[PDB]
Amino acid sequence: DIVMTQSPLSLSVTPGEPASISCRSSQSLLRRDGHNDLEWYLQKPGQSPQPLIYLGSTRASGVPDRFSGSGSGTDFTLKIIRVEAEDAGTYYCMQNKQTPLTFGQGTRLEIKRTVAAPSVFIFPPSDEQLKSGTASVVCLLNNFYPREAKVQWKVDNALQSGNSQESVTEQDSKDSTYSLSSTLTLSKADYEKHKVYACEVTHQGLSSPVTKSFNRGEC
Amino acid sequence: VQLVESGGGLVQPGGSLKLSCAASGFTLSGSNVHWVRQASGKGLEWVGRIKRNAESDATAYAASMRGRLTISRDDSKNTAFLQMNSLKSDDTAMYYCVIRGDVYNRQWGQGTLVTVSSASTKGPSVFPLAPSSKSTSGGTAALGCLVKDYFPEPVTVSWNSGALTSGVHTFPAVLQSSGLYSLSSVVTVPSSSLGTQTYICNVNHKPSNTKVDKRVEPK
Numbered sequence: 001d002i003v004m005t006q007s008p009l010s011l012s013v014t015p016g017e018p019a020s021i022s023c024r025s026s027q028s029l030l031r032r033d034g035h036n037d038l039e040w041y042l043q044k045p046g047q048s049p050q051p052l053i054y055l056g057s058t059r060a061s062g063v064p065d066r067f068s069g070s071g072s073g074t075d076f077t078l079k080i081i082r083v084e085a086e087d088a089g090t091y092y093c094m095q096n097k098q099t100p101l102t103f104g105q106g107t108r109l110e111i112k113r114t115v116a117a118p119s120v121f122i123f124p125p126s127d128e129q130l131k132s133g134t135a136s137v138v139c140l141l142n143n144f145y146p147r148e149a150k151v152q153w154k155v156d157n158a159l160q161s162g163n164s165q166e167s168v169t170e171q172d173s174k175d176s177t178y179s180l181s182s183t184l185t186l187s188k189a190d191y192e193k194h195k196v197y198a199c200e201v202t203h204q205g206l207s208s209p210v211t212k213s214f215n216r217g218e219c
Numbered sequence: 220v221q222l223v224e225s226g227g228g229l230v231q232p233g234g235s236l237k238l239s240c241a242a243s244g245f246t247l248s249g250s251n252v253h254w255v256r257q258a259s260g261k262g263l264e265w266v267g268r269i270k271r272n273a274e275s276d277a278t279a280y281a282a283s284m285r286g287r288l289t290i291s292r293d294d295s296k297n298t299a300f301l302q303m304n305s306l307k308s309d310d311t312a313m314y315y316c317v318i319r320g321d322v323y324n325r326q327w328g329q330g331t332l333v334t335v336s337s338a339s340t341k342g343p344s345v346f347p348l349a350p351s352s353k354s355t356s357g358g359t360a361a362l363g364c365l366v367k368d369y370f371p372e373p374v375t376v377s378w379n380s381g382a383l384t385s386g387v388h389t390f391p392a393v394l395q396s397s398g399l400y401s402l403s404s405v406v407t408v409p410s411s412s413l414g415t416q417t418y419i420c421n422v423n424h425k426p427s428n429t430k431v432d433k434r435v436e437p438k
Contacts, residue, residue: 001282039325041263048315049255049263051325060325092263096319099279101253101265119407121354121361129346129365138348140361140405142388167390167402179388181403185395214353 002027002095006104013083014112015176021107023076023093029056030073037097040069040078043106044089045170052091053078085111088171113176117205118144122212125191135191137184139199139212143177150202151182152209156194160184191216220244220323224316227331229340229371229426230306238301238331240316242323247292248272250320252299254290255327256312259372264312269299271320306335334371338398342427343369345420347435348403355410362435363405364420368397369427376404377421413437 003026013019021040029036036056041049051060053069056076066081080087088111093104118141125135141149147168153160163186169179182199198213223241230236240252251274254266267280269290280288289302299316316328348354348363355361366374376389386407392400404420414437423430 041325048327048330050327054325094263099265099268100281101255101268103263103265106262119356119359119361121356123348123354123363126346126349126365129344129367132344132346134367136346136365136367136401138363138365138403140354140363140403142361142405142407165393165395165401167393169388169390179390179405181388181390181405183393183401183403212353 001100002029002097002102004093004095004102004104006093006107008107009105010108010110012110012112013080015083015085017083019080019083019087019109021078021091021093023071023078023104025074025076025095027095027097028073029095029097036072036076037095038069038071038076039094039096041092041094042087042089043092044086044173049092083109083111085176086173087111088173088176111171111176113145115205116143116145116177118142118149118180118201118203120199120201120210120212122197122199122214124197124214124216130188130191133188135186135188137186137197137199139182139184139201141180141182141201141203143172143175143179144203144205145177146204147178148204149180151180152200152202153182153184154196154198154200155184155186156196222316222318222323222326222328224314224328224331226300227314227333229334229336231337232307232335234306234335235302235304236306236333238303238314238316238333240299240301240328242297242299242318245320245322247297247299248294250318250322252290252292253317253319254301255315255317257315257330258312261312266301266314303333306333308335311335332371332373336371338370340426341368341370341399342429343367343374343422343424345422345431345433347433348405349435350413350437358410359407360410360413360437361405361407362418362437363403364422364433364435365401365403366422366424367401368395368399369401369424369429370399371426372400374400374402374422374424376402378404378406379417379419380421383418
């Protein structure tokens with residue numbers, strides 16, 4: 001089958017600056033009419049892929065001037081002349097010369113923005129969850145940049161290792177930030193045995209690590 | 220113009236599923252209908268296609284999906300179908316219907332998730348993440364809903380029946396050690412609104428017919 005090789009696999013561009021993505025075909029994609037059997041799709045977070053370029057260089061309906069497809073035969077380039085926050089997503093090249101239709105690995109475009117320290121919030125287990133027999137402590141790290149963040153959990157000064165799970169949202173299409181949720185899992189018995197639940201957050205935007213805590217039964 | 224996708228869902232290994240791609244506003248017999256799948260956090264993989272009537276309703280399939288696929292069209296229903304037999308865990312993915320024609324050209328459907336697992340469906344427990352002093356930083360409060368212990372994916376979470384979108388972060392689900400997923404959905408809102416403005420999270424887990432409207436109250 002026709003192998004599609006995308007380069008780079010990820011890049012970070014500050015809005016207003018250009019972005020370029022290379023696509024290499026293992027077979028000639030050149031057509032009799034002078035066009036190429038090469039397309040570009042973008043997949044924004046939480047959405048289906050969407051057409052950008054077809055026939056090598058033709059813009060899909062609704063796709064602005066700032067996006068261009070170029071190259072011929074085997075070597076292709078997708079250019080974004082001026083990057084915007086909304087362009088955050090994964091870009092894919094695809095061949096439609098023959099079946100199977102094949103795609104490149106995908107290129108993840110990160111929108112570079114100013115360092116934003118997260119807003120940190122802590123949520124004790126709800127009385128209703130405790131009533132059901134379980135306990136989940138939730139630490140929210142809201143709207144931060146870059147994505148690298150560290151969350152440390154402590155229960156009465158004991159560092160928790162292996163009993164929490166994190167989930168990071170994809171880059172926000174508007175303000176270019178990420179959000180993270182760390183969940184501490186404990187049995188109801190262990191939850192009721194301790195007082196201080198502390199979430200310690202490390203991030204580039206914080207001069208020192210930030211601790212958000214609560215005491216069970218208030219104090 | 221709309222593409223309605225259905226027929227996905229939980230299926231046991233070695234089982235069968237029939238995906239539907241219902242077209243509205245245009246005739247499918249004049250278009251080429253493709254199927255593309257994407258495993259969670261992965262790239263794109265073409266599965267097969269059925270050409271238009273003028274192209275002898277010719278079908279092609281991916282080598283990976285060898286002799287297990289049957290793509291067809293019910294021109295009376297204006298629907299395309301992808302019948303998949305003898306499924307394996309490696310077939311777990313979001314399946315997209317792609318139109319190649321005059322209308323909805325190189326455009327994708329919202330997709331339908333196929334889960335090939337031995338695990339049984341479980342509806343979630345919905346617990347509030349109540350706003351309080353520990354979730355109030357500055358003049359901003361955070362609140363949410365903990366959507367716990369469900370299988371399979373997906374769960375949809377909205378706030379105030381779609382009227383609350385600004386400040387919302389529905390986190391990707393994590394698979395817990397139990398084999399059950401869990402997610403949090405949060406909102407940051409003004410702290411001055413906490414006593415007067417009502418905040419309801421609308422959770423729907425269609426695999427288990429679980430639909431819950433949860434009111435998240437402060438204190």
